[PDB]
Amino acid sequence: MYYGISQFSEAYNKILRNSSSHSSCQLVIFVSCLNIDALCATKMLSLLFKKQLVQSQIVPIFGYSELRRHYSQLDDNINSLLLVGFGGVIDLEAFLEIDPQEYVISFRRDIYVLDAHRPWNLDNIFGSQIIQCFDDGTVDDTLGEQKEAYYKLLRKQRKKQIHEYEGVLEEYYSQGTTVVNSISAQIYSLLSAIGETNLSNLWLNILGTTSLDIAYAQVYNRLYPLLQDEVKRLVKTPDTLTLNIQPDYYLFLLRHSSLYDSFYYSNYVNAKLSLWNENGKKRLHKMFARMGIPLSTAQETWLYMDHSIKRELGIIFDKNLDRYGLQDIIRDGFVRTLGYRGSISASEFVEALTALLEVGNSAQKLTNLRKRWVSNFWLSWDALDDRKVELLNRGIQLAQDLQRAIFNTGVAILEKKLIKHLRIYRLCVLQDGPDLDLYRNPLTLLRLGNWLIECCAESEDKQLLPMVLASIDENTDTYLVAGLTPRYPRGLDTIHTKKPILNNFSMAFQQITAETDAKVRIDNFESSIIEIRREDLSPFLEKLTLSGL
Amino acid sequence: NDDDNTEIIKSFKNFILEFRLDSQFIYRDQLRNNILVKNYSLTVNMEHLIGYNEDIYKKLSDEPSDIIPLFETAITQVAKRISILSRAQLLNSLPTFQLILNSNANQIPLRDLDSEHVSKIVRLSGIIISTSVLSSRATYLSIMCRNCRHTTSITINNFNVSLPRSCLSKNCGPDPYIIIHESSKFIDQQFLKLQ
Amino acid sequence: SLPAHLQQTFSPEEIQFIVENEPIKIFPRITTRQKIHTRWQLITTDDKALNNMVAMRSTEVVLWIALLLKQQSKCSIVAPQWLTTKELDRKIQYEKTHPDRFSELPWNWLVLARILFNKAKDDFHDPIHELRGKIQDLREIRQIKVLKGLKYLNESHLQLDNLSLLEINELRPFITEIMDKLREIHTASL
């Protein structure tokens, strides 16, 4: 590894020696837009560098074209550069035509790349001195064999060693993309090693960790005890600030919407009870009647909801959920209270942030969309501070609206049975429908796909197949295709979790595009999301059917 | 009996004098600006009351008609505290302050009202179809006897009193009292119809 | 400075600046004693205090320098004597018992309070909310006394012994104009 866990501080010191100045901006940070963990890490770094009065600039970027153009724009004055949320999986030097002899003097510049994706470019570490990254503890133990082959490959019977090295490199490659650690977690480890921990840093670390609950529950479960222990280690006065471990549930905005809607819109409850048809609603009404909460009482705001039932809700759930089999909905979460404002949970706050990112405020229209996205990112960033709450109530109401729209589209999809079951991978295309303009956002498409894959997993089928989802943008006449990984049921043991399910869609797309002159545009930081032509979708599809996945 | 009333009044006065968000005591400034313009009233939002402490809201929702007057007299006590000087010891033309509430609870249709909504706080919407003419109501009654012929005063609240039996201590009648209309305080009441 | 009518009175930012250009006490966290190193050599403040400074000792600096050192970890501001509950209690008792005289308070009243409450939060020995409420009560009663005293507006003169800068500033454009109008009426009538 380049920078181990114990070396962070040392590297940090170097930054000061190259950036701490009186009247010169010598530090620029590029952030992976449309990502919560990157936003939390950027906030923590901004606070850190505002403490010691180190001048800096924050620049959001969306695509690799923007990254290349912005790097080409930069001047030689910038000694230190930060790249948070991307860059691990590709070789920057080849992309950025970096000449080490041009930057020898050594260490003319410094580029610190900080990413969480686990399959990363081996040459980027073992070949280059200018580029350096913060390892999470993977190179030391996992790559004890690949490095030997790379070092050896960097009298006629000696070709056996070359063949073995080539085979080892090939075996290391052709692996799916996954995430195994958190950027905010690494930054908080650095902060704990330095000695600048406090409540704001703990809150941001909690947000960054809990942003992965939907997709990387294994990482979340591996990392949770550290957060619990750290929170334990660290009169209602109008200036109090409380962080506690309160029971919480897999519910959609429980403390801001009625309990009926909370049960209605919850993805896990939907998957377990089939609420898209009438039998689901009948079962929900049976549930409510047997618990004993009146239907008129359960349809009121959580503030005015009955105090006694609010107190005994835990016992009611414990005694009633076993028959319906929802006993996996109860978990432990973090709750933050400040004075007389109210109570917010981490899940609710991250859903509000995600929805505020989603909604707020040919090539030219694509550029306009991308600048709208970066403006939404900045507005979401501004919403972080405690002095603004009209930028969070709006986010909560927009989250409610977006979840309603997603539910309305998913029920129609499941009615129409558009999910075609092929031999290898499932496929569905949203050819026509209402409010299809909302799905031009990749994060909204991922939300819809997450709900669909949860619904598919919560069935009796014994086939784990990748799912392909596509949409339409009639103005551009292009399909937005995103590949989705299969997921195990949330109520499963750890023995069948030897390795998380990988994603081969990026490899398949790149191979097809490199062997066939298709009219696509692969520039998103997510390598499994592409834009394809309406006329070019199908042939491409058959190609993907005929290619080794 | 009187101890509980004093405790409730103290709780509401502490709520008024201690509630602050960021760097502003909103309700005290509201009282100031209301007294300056001669609008003896105060507006309370449910969310602030619940966030401050839940027991006060629970008691208000339990028996509203008995608890509201205590709050409306705590308001005028605070107003007299923060509007006039003791001067080491006058007009004092400050009547009992009016309390106005706002809420965002679930609405209840008119036809849904039934026996379980008796003596409860409800929110509902309709259309006004007719307004009655305003009438007078008594609040501070100066009462004179006829045989013993002494003076007494009666204070009347509007929520939820008759001529006292026997005289105050010779051998008067059952209710030998009359109403002195001068030196009496009156307010306005109006009737409305909702559809 | 013209800006319409901003040439006649002081804006609140100017009041904050003129108040923060005042001495204050400080407990430094570092040492800068000369070797027996760059000279401060400032022009509008004595350097000998700053240069000949040793840690954990009392010294006097201007308020803005104290705030600048407080932004880093190089400072620990000492709160004044009048910012404590036991002093404000006797003060408020003095206003309550005397219904005609304004109590003696520094002319930086409410302003040093605002600055210290905004910046120097973790160095107070008393809870912040209690002090803020007591200061609010003081402001309330002084406002009542000012409103009561404003009724007499002679055309000759007036006396206001112990009013702070903000209280005079927010009342100047009204009292001045009313008295000027009265003077004009009287002079035109003779």
Next chain:
Amino acid sequence: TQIYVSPQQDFSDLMKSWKNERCSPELLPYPHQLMKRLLNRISMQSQLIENISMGFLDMQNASNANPPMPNESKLPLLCMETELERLKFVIRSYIRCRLSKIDKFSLYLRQLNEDENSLISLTDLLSKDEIKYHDTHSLIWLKLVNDSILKYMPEELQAINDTEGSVNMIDEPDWNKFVFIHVNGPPDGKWNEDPLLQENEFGKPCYTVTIPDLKEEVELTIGSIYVMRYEVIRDLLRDDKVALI
């Protein structure tokens, strides 16, 4: 001024002069020597900060060497530059206020200047650039108003400096405006050798002033804020005896 006790005394005098000028209803004279010292001080301060910045920059960019130690390096330079910025702001505000006042009373000042009997001359009250400003502004405004309106105006009243008829065009300053004062007393530490102050019961030395129009006598004790007209208090202001707020 004739000599300096300390530059901080000059700063205090400048601040007091600015405060007096901002609220006074009449244009006051010009303290030439104070700003003559202050501008030169600013010149040396800027020169030295630039020299030291050049020195550190050359030391850092001649070779790798050793980067400057963060301690006792950034904070002093920050303090000097921010102090210079604040002083520049104060000077700028004072100059702009004086420019606004000179713009207001241009015609009255010009009429006063040509009077030989007036012991007050334009040279004392103004800096040279202000004299040039007044001259050019008056000339251009007169040319504009003559080209716009007065060319069609009858000759008998074409003059804009007319003081006869119904209404006069000369804008005299209002000497009777009410101002807020703080009785500073004598500037000396003894504060008791002044030949004007008197005594009341319980000591409390006071200054006695009279209002010619109202036929009254008003006591002005030390340490009390008053609300008094400006005409009767010009001398005490000019003697640094009272300070306007």
Next chain:
Amino acid sequence: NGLDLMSSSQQDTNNLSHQEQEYLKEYCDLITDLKSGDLVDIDLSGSLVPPSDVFIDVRVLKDAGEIQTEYGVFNLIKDSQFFVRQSDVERLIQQGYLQKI
């Protein structure tokens, strides 16, 4: 700053009379001349809000290239945030190229 800002206030300033326009031009000339005398080291046309803080956060409003500063360069990438000195961006803020003081 005595420039009349023809690059950005009414655009063509044609609602003024020609005499008023030449008066405006000569007044701009006078303002430029005035600060060329003994006050060359002070910018009179600067801000009049007293300097309260030394380091502030500022957000870009319009896109441009990179601008040279003293010992540094500021690349005005569209919609970015700077944590820079207060005494370095007042000119840009007055011009309207920056936001969120």
